[PDB]
Design a protein around this nucleic acid. Sequence first.
DNA 1: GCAACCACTTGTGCATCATGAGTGATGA
DNA 2: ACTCATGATGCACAAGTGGTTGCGCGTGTTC
Lengths: 292, 305, 280, 241, 93, 93
Amino acid sequence: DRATFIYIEHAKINRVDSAVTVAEAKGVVRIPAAMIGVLLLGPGTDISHRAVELLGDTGTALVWVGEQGVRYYASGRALARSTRFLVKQAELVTNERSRLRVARRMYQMRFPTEDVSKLTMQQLRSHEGARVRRKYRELSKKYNVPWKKRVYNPDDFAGGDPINQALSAAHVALYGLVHSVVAALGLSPGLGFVHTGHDRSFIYDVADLYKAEITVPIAFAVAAEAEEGQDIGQLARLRTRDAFVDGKILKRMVKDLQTLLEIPEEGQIEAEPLSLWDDKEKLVPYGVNYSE
Amino acid sequence: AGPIIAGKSESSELPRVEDRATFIYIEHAKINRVDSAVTVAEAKGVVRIPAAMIGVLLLGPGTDISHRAVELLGDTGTALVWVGEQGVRYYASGRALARSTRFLVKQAELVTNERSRLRVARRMYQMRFPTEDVSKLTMQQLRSHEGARVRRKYRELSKKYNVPWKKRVYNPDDFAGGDPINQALSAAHVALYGLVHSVVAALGLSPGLGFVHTGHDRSFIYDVADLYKAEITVPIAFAVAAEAEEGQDIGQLARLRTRDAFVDGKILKRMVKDLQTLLEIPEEEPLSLWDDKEKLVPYGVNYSE
Amino acid sequence: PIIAGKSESSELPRVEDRATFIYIEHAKINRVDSAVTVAEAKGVVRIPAAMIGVLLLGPGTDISHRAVELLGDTGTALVWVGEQGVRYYASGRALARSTRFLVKQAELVTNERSRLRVARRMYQMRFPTEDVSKLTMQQLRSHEGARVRRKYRELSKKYNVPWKKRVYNPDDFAGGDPINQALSAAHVALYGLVHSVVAALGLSPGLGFVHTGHDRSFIYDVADLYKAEITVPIAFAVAAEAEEGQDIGQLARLRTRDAFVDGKILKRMVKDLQTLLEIP
Amino acid sequence: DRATFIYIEHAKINRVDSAVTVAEAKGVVRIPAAMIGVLLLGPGTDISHRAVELLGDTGTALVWVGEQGVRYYASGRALARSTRFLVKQAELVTNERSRLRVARRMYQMRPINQALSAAHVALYGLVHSVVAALGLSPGLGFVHTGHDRSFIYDVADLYKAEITVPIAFAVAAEAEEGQDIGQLARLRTRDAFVDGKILKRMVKDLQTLLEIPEEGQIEAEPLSLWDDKEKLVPYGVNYSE
Amino acid sequence: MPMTVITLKNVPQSLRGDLTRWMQEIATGVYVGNFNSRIREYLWRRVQETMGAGEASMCFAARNELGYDFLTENASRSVIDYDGLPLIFIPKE
Amino acid sequence: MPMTVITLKNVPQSLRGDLTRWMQEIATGVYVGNFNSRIREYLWRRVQETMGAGEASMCFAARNELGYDFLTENASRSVIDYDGLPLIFIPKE
DNA sequence: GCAACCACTTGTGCATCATGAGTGATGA
DNA sequence: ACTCATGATGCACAAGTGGTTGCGCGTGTTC
């Protein structure tokens, strides 16, 4: 019931007998294949053929991500080739009753202090619009960042206020993490409940649960402590990856996904965002060898 | 449109899914991105892959691939399949280069509904065997009958080319062999599965939302590939095994003839049209909100008051 | 062996499959590195002479001996298209090594009955809506003239351009009017193409049927088959659509090349040259 | 009845009003266009468009030849754009009686291998130059048929046995070891052709073979620009240096 | 599909490798590939603002009697129209 | 008539000017032209017997997935077959 | 670790120039 | 006068090596 989300970067992964060999700069680590649930291959990663074969033999989910999963680049199969999440999501989105229930549940997740089990889609979207306006206004007041209106161009990132650029960069980093988690769990990024018609509708639906809590404050902080002529997008992406370093957000995302899909708590899985050289003490008893 | 940078390309700039080359097989090399190019660096020299024209990239034994190379291949819509020994070993692909989920939505609506799923499975069976009529066959009967006729086809093609076959059927789940016939069958089938995975990932369809196969994330890949495994991969692999002589690389000639049969059979456009017709989709911003009364609602708008 | 600057007829494209013409003026055709190079003041343009049938030499072109030798080797005929008509012709050895066409043309031009029959077929091709089964030689000339003036008048009225009751002649047709320049340009392009095709097929340009007495009579006879169909309407259209300050010759050559490509005058010309001489 | 055959080489021909201008190394020669007749443009010739126009106005047969007509490269129109010789040749060649008569008339008139081939090719070039200048079709041959140069070969067979064969045998005897025999044969043939008597005889025999009446015939004048300055000064051919 | 030919010289190495994703290199700075009109137009569009201060020339099948046409942007050898016929012009220094 | 491309370098100037009689030269050492199979074969045979101590590579339309096939004679970049797909191979010094 | 940018050497080939040698491509 | 071959002669550009920075490509509750 425990899934480990191992993050690898700046390393060359190979295979010896049944364990992947992560040749970092710090040293060589010998993680057994069976313990790895999800492999987050970050930048500067050279994966071998035998490593991929061994990881796919044990049902590992290889997801090629950015620094701490800010960007989703590619992914392999699902965690243990488990399509039960995908089937449940398809069943929930297919008919209007379960789609309505799931949308209400996401809006409730975004509305802890209000009950939205009786509001309609028009009322729900109006409430979210009011909530995001209020959140933007109060964060602007807190961070002393001037704010007028969310204006941006999907094709012209350079032209825009620094706050809007930071918002876009942080939101896209959150989208990358959402897509990484979704691809690891085997869900379909296109089968969205509130958003529909796009290949990443579910990604945006899930990321909207964390926009008002994670990425919007990060973007406002970035815009506040930014100098003129500085790369706002890079700053926001780096701050978002720093926030993603802890791994609490990824575990919360896995739990919230399983909650949304009505997965019983008995059948729910638990994400374990392990680290290699920061969690040597935890991994040594599991058989993970270390070399220096 | 927007600014154009090396290594990142839009869906429009890419060829259509049905207008690309089928597959390339790379082994004992090291795929690596240098200067925004998918480069295969062997011991002798370096080969640049035209990934925009390639549907799926097949990674063989001894193959090392970098992170940026994987990102570039995913950007070009090229799918990654680690085709080692004993069949396909892994799958990988980037974001779908189709921004509309209409195909995926229709596939989900068909697979969730039991009657729709049964109808789709019957359509696939009819497409595999057009002469018969299966308007009254059930799911278990469909599976048993497809297995029986696949075994019969294998026996017939073994008799035609006079090759010893041990009454076996190819299965991507742990199929191993050492005979040249086994190697040719494995090569043709892994090429077919890579092509099917590339097409499905390109069209936005979910590989796990299968109708005939269930229980894994690549069930729909198996379902789509079964439509053509008996009509191309098996006869071509048997022909390769019959033609193969002493001291000849079975995999090389098997993949060569597999590509020849894919080109002659027009497997790529045929697969696109078969996926069009199987989902009962008539010929015809993608993102929008969902509503009950008004169906789709425009996105990117703030609803005050 | 293979020597740079020399090629066989097999290595050259067929008469049908090459471009129609290239016009050159105020330049210097020259051979450097065994290439047909057209040198202007601003730079040099190298011509793929194997892909062009005839090269029109306008005013100011200074061509050398080896350039002419190379152009004749490629099969590209030369015509000096000066002001007021075609001024001089030139062609190298025919890139057709069989004279079956030439022998047949000779045997149908020496015989008077054969000459009558060939002129009959050419009139029938120009005017397929009539009957000339009993029509004679000078009457054929008179009918051809009457119908060419009728076509000229009809096209002048259609495009609303003043025409001074004349028909273009290759010999001394001088005019400053835009219609005169357009007619001259289109007609010299047609005559150059006809001369190129005739020289390429091994036919004798002097063995004419309607035209006789000079060595370019067959050229005139072949060009008459397409003069009123293509070149005259093209020239009238050019004069109609011509603006102020627009080079009449350049746009006229544009339009006549477009008509040649659209009308397939090259393949049609070879096919007609085959049928007029009864080659099965 | 005078048809001058002016051979120009190593020159640049431009046009002064109603007179071509030949600018060789020796000097500048102005020639009225009416007396050009046949202009044999040898190697090193850069003919101008306006000179071509003037020569075409006066019925000039421009033929691009080699050194003294060894090789035939290209040709323009005929003498006074006349086709009487061509028409006569065609009439003689299509029917059987005149063809047999002309073949009989030709028969009545009529290292070492490499030299013979080179000399024969030089004779072919000169014969083709003369034929193209006169207006005859090189393809319509009497003894030889089915080739683009059949008539050229037939006419060259007249002079093969008494010009090309002696030259080829002389150069074969005189040849040094490791020497280009073809170049030597071509140079000796052009040296033989310098005098121009062979050109006159080729023109005379071409006119004779077509049964052209002697009164209506025209005689060839192998004119030389510098070797015959005294002959051209009364003609109006200005000279300069 | 018409065969498209692109020649690059003095261009950033990033574009040199980028064009290899669509059309191969047969010689230093020479590219050949089969595309339709839309892909070729988008690829020349990409080349235009990626070549930097370099020279790019593209040749593709066309509907003229030569059978091809040329697109060049900031190239040594321009293209001159000789009465509806594309001929490569080489300016003299 | 399919489009054909020939690239030359380190070849005699005679061949450089001679190929311009058939196919135009868009950039230094690269030629483009539309010919049938016979003319293209004759042009390639002419190139083989005139370049001498040089390298030549030709690209032409073919009947494979990429739509083209390559002929090279003593060229720096060779051509190798990937399951029937011609891809350019660049040797490492 | 990977990949791009960058500086910087090193090198291959192309284009220009000046000189000198040929007039050329060679089958009934 | 032309054209080609040849010998210097210089020059633009490409490929390599060497550290140095960064991990990248930025919409989806904006009219």
